[PDB]
């Protein structure tokens, strides 16, 4: 019923999808009755460092459009001193809500999603971006295809420590993203993150960095999937598999 204008084009709001601090995401319809997602950002209480982090992220989203379809489509935007309006493609659901709603995941679906995550994250690395806070909430299902929605640049399932690499707890390398992606895949395999059993956040951080804390990798029919997991979840980033290596791995390549 409500409406909004973005670069002269009018959009009618269908429903609110997301909500950040000063941001809101809405499912909308244009004049041609085409569906889109509009992200609204209130810049009223935003300082210069915040504004520039927002502008840097918008520029990377706009640039990386061309380089990969595993990155969310950004059709247009309007930016003033009071607000940002971002016209994007609308997803069906984020990966976190999908993983929470669905109990068991198909191995084919899992493999397909993993490929998409690698392609998206690989793309940002080729441009010098290390996300450093990947979690299922950063991925959107858009027509049986996972797409990355953000680059971790803009000032921010927020707070979560379950996908955090041991090197990030000690303190900035593409290997940090590999650990996080490994945690997402571990969740899509075992239905839990590697340290989800630890309630206490301090004890949890202690176990992620603890080399004497053996991560369990229960036996599964996909031995190649178990290997990817063991390779991503190597505490020493030097011993950790890289994205180009993950793309050549049997799990992703072999039918
Ligand atoms: C029906 O739409 C959804 C329902 C539940 C969760 C997600 C979606 N779809 C959606 C959510 C979105 N969030 C962003 C976004 C937030 N920050 C940058 O892009 C784009 C987007 C595009 N489509």
Swiss-Prot record:
Job of this protein: Involved in mitotic spindle assembly checkpoint signaling, a process that delays anaphase until chromosomes are bioriented on the spindle, and in the repair of incorrect mitotic kinetochore-spindle microtubule attachments. Phosphorylates MAD1L1 to promote the mitotic spindle assembly checkpoint. Phosphorylates CDCA8/Borealin leading to enhanced AURKB activity at the kinetochore. Phosphorylates SKA3 at 'Ser-34' leading to dissociation of the SKA complex from microtubules and destabilization of microtubule-kinetochore attachments. Phosphorylates KNL1, KNTC1 and autophosphorylates.
Family from the record: Belongs to the protein kinase superfamily. Ser/Thr protein kinase family.
Residues binding ATP, per UniProt: 17-25, 39
Taxonomic source organism: Homo sapiens
Subunit structure: Interacts with TPR; the interactions occurs in a microtubule-independent manner. Interacts with MAD1L1 and MAD2L1.
Effect the entry attributes to changing residue 150 to A: Loss of kinase activity
Residue range from the parent sequence: 519 to 794 of 857
Domain Protein kinase: from-to ranges: 11-252
Name of protein: Dual specificity protein kinase TTK
Tissue: Present in rapidly proliferating cell lines.
Active site: 133 (proton acceptor)
Taxonomic superkingdom: Eukaryota
């Amino acid at each position: 019923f409500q409406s909004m204008s973005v670069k002269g084009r009018i959009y009618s709001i269908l429903k609110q999808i997301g909500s950040g601090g000063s941001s809101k995401v809405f499912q909308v319809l244009n004049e041609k009755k085409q569906i889109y997602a509009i992200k609204y950002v209130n810049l009223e209480e935003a300082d210069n460092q915040t504004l520039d982090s927002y502008r840097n992220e918008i520029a990377y989203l706009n640039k990386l459009q061309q380089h990969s379809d595993k990155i969310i489509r950004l059709y247009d935007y309007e930016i003033t001193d009071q607000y940002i309006y971002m016209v994007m493609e609308c997803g069906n659901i984020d990966l976190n809500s999908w993983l929470k709603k669905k109990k068991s995941i198909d191995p084919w679906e899992r493999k397909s999603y993993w490929k998409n995550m690698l392609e998206a994250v690989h793309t940002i690395h080729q441009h010098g971006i290390v996300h450093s806070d990947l979690k299922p909430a950063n991925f959107l299902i858009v027509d049986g295809m996972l797409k990355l929605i953000d680059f971790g640049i803009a000032n921010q399932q927020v707070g979560t420590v379950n996908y955090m690499p041991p090197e990030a707890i000690k303190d900035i390398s593409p290997k940090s993203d590999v650990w996080s992606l490994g945690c997402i895949l571990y969740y899509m395999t075992y239905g839990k993150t590697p340290f989800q059993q630890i309630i206490n956040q301090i004890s949890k951080l202690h176990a992620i960095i603890d080399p004497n804390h053996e991560i369990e990798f229960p036996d599964i029919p996909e031995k190649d999937l178990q290997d990817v997991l063991k390779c991503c979840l190597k505490r020493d980033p030097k011993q950790r598999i890289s994205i180009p290596e993950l793309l050549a791995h049997p799990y992703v390549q072999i039918q």
